[PDB]
Structures are given as C-alpha cells and as structure tokens.
Amino acid sequence: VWKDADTTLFCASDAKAHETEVHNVWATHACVPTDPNPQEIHLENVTENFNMWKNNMVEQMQEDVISLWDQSLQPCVKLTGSVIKQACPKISFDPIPIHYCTPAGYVILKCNDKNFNGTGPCKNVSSVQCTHGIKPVVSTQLLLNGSLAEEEIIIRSENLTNNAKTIIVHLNKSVEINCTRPSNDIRKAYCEINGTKWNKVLKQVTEKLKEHFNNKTIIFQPPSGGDLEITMHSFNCRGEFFYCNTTQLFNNTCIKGCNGTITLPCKIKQIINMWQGTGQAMYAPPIDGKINCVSNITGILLTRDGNTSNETFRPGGGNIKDNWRSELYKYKVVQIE
C-alpha cells in the first residue's frame, strides 16, 4: 500500500535555458525539463482522505517561490537586517508553470472527485509523477492565472464555521482583468474589468455562499482595515507592484443598470511591504512603456464576520500559501516502500 509521507519534490519545467526571465533563470538551475508522457493510474475502489490545509507540498512550493524571489528581486532600500542599498537591476518577470514531482518510492495521489472541496475523503482517485503546471503569482484578494473548477463553484475552507480561517472561492468561468499603466504621471494605473462578466459570476458565487450559510443574506464590503497590500489588490506585473482599489468590484447593488466596464484606481508603490517576512522594502521608479497584464481571475480569497439574518464577506489575502493551496488541493505525497 502507501502511507502518507513526505519527500523532496523535483520540478519539471519547460523553461528554455536562454531567457533572462528570472523564473526561467531559477527554473533552469533548479528544475529539469518536463515529462513528455505523463501517465495517470486511476485507482479503482480505493478511498483516500486529502487535506489542502495540511498538505506538505504547499510548504515546498512556498520555499521555492521565496528562494526564486530572493535571488531575483533585490531592494534598493531593504528595510530588514541596517542600511542595505543593494543593487536593483531591471530584469524580465513573467511567471512560468512549475510541476512538482515525486521520485521512485513515492507517488503523487490525485483526487478526481469533481466537486471536491479540498478536505475530507476522495473516492475517485489516481496516481501521478507530477502536478499540472503552476504559475507562482503573488497576489491578494484575487487568485490570478490559476485553475477553474470542473463543474460547480467550489468553496474551500478548513472550517466553514470558523470565521478565522480564510475561505478560498474557486470559479468555473474566468474573468479577464486588463491592468494597464500609461507611459508618458508615473504612479497611477487602471485595471479594466468587464462589469457584465463579473457580476453575472459574483452572483453565481453568492448563490453558492447561500448554500453553505442557510440562505442568509450574503453581503460584500471593502476590507475592514489593514495593510495596504491586503486592503488593496497587491500583485506583480512585469516586475512592478500594482496596488488596485477593488471596492467597485465587490458590489451588492448589482447582484438594475450595472453592465458598464468597471475600472480600479490603481497606483504603483515603491515603499512596500514584504510577503516573505516582516519588514519594508523599496524598488526603483516603475519602468517606461504601456505596462499591462492580461490576467485571468480564477479565485477569490475571503474573510467572514461575526450572526443574525445576514453574513458579511470581505476580501482576504496575506497567507500566500493559500494561493498554492488553491492549486495543490487535489494532490498529496505518499510513500510506497
């Protein structure tokens, strides 16, 4: 059989060993070329319990993205150790899909329960060497470029009744989020989003959040207060730190004239926070040219509140592991020998 176990996972990459893109740079030095022929062994009449909040792989993937970021991005004013003014060149930044894989003596067990919440038992199951590709995008509030749920919008948590544990919302349709910054002031950008797309789905989400809260009134509001990075929508595009006001996205009035394309007042910061550890940093004034990411929204991180006839949900974000958890939910390491 196979006992739940851990092991160091090796990364299948497609990263061509010629690009100065700092993901390619790292993923060539640390990672092998991809599998040409991924095999999947569907294990019949075998049930296995998974847990996305207690899956080891999350921490390994997390180790890498830090390592990757720490060798590739260096702050001109790194406010951690005293007076660090170390070099900050302008290098290529575009996420690439990593495959984490187990050597012989270990398998990756993949769950095929199509509407699987991430924790608890999985009846329909398989075996793999490797995961699907995963882009290590660093973001809060919205999960960009991830996966879609197979059928239904699946709501993920360790404890639904515990308002402390963050809820991962997994979409089934994707929403494009055009995030542009005009060339030639510097510190001001805009994320163009289709309104008629977003609220048709934010509703589909509400009906799902009803299903797990006894048909109570589902209500969104801007983050109750907290660091600029998790109150605003903080992510990275072409080596720049976007900070977008996502208030106009989480609208209740819509879910009625709402069709119109919504746009977020973004503004790129230099004096920023750190998601790796506690402390501040500083990077150079943003690069020139029409900066844009054609990002595809596939998830929402959410925090609840304390209970009468309504339930409040504000945008979550901070535990960047959760991002990897949203992608690694159906996989688990197992020893054979």
Partner: antibody, heavy 123, light 109 residues
C-alpha cells in the same frame, strides 16, 4: 549553465577502493537525481548508477552492483562514489551528470555533465 | 549494449543518419537520448525524449525512433559537427541505462 565538478585520486593501486568526488555548487543537489558514468580511454560509455538528492534511493548497474556505493553529502554539496577492490579494467575517465528520471515514460537522460577525471589503476 | 555503426562520413552541407538498433526492452520501452562528444571533452546532451533539443542546438539535428530502433538525422553538415555520437535508452530487462556502442561522424576533408 548548470555546473558540475569531478575529483579523484588520478592514480590508484589495484584492489584498493576508488573514491571519486562530484561537487554541485548552487544547491539543487537535494532536488534532482545524479548519475556516475565512466568511459575507458578510447572505448564506450558505461552508466554505473544514480542517487536521488534526498532519497537516498539508489539504482545500480547490476554487474557493478556488488562494488559501487553512491552517497550525497547534502550539507557540503557533494555526490561521491566508492568503488571497492578496483582492477586494471576500472581504469577509465569518470564524470557525474544530472539526471532526469520519470520512472514510467522512459526518459532516462543526462542533461548536465561535468568536465571529467581520469583514473589510472596501476600497482 | 545497444548497437550503432562505428563510422559515418560525408561532405559538408550534407544529410546523414546514425542508427541505434535496440530491442523491445529498451527502445520498445524508453525515450531515446543522444550524446555528442567532440574530441576530447566530456559529452553533452544532444537529443532527449526521442527528439528534443536543449536550447542552442540546431534543428539540423533531428531525433527519431521506430519500434526497437532509433536514428539521429543531421543536415547542413559543418566541420563543428565532427564528433562521436551515442544513443541512450533506459532498459527494464536489466534495469540499466544501455548506451549505444558508438559512431564517429567524420566531415571531409
């Protein structure tokens, strides 16, 4: 751009033990598989075995199974081999290589080779 | 040990093919790799997974396999190509990487 460095006695007596060093600067040692391959001067290539970075799962060349040890000092970034009761035959050029090894597709290939070390077996 | 002809030779700018005769339990199993060794340095990977080139390796080099036999097709021959060539399949009979015997590409000259 992925580096390997071999090291060894160069001259070794017969019926001794051949001790070969392969240094992998830049971490990544615990991550991948790594092989030891020899080549007699002016002759064919011979894969000896491999060892996973962590593992320590190892797979040996059955005709050399009895005499080959592969170990991975992860703290010092090293992957070395011991070869016991060496003969005149084991005189060859030795190099380590990084290994891609997906079990159940085939895909046993060496994508990153070190430069090489020559070992002479003469009493 | 896999079988391949010792000498291949042709004028510059021409196409050559390098055999690699195996069996059901190596090339009938595994993906094939090829190793270019110029004299007298260590080998480098030329082809893998039957037919894939690691960045900065001409499509002039081209991999293939047929049942229990592989080939390395080379076009646009230059002097730089003059080297030794070894195919590399995994083998579940004896659980080994079985190397091709060896072929010497000679550009004339």
């Amino acid at each position: 751009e992925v580096q390997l460095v071999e090291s060894g006695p160069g001259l070794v007596k017969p019926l001794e033990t051949l001790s070969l060093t392969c240094a992998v600067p830049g971490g990544s040692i615990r991550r991948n598989y790594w092989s030891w391959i020899r080549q007699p001067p002016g002759k064919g290539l011979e894969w000896i075995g491999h060892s996973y970075g962590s593992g320590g799962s190892t797979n040996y060349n059955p005709s050399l199974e009895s005499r080959v040890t592969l170990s991975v000092d992860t703290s010092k970034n090293l992957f070395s081999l011991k070869l016991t009761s060496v003969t005149a035959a084991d005189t060859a050029v030795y190099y380590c290589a990084r290994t891609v090894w997906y079990y159940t597709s085939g895909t046993h290939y060496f994508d990153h080779w070190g430069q090489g070390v020559l070992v002479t077996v003469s009493s | 040990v896999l079988t391949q002809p010792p000498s291949v030779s042709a004028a510059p700018g021409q196409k050559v093919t390098i055999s690699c005769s195996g069996s059901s339990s190596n090339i009938g199993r595994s993906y094939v790799s090829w190793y270019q060794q110029v004299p007298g340095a260590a080998p480098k990977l030329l082809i893998y997974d039957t037919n894939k080139r690691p960045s900065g390796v001409s499509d002039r080099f081209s991999g293939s396999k047929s049942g229990s036999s592989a080939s390395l097709a080379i076009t646009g021959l230059q002097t730089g190509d003059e080297a030794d060539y070894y195919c590399g399949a995994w083998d579940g009979s004896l659980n080994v990487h079985i190397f091709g015997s060896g072929t010497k590409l000679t550009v004339l000259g």
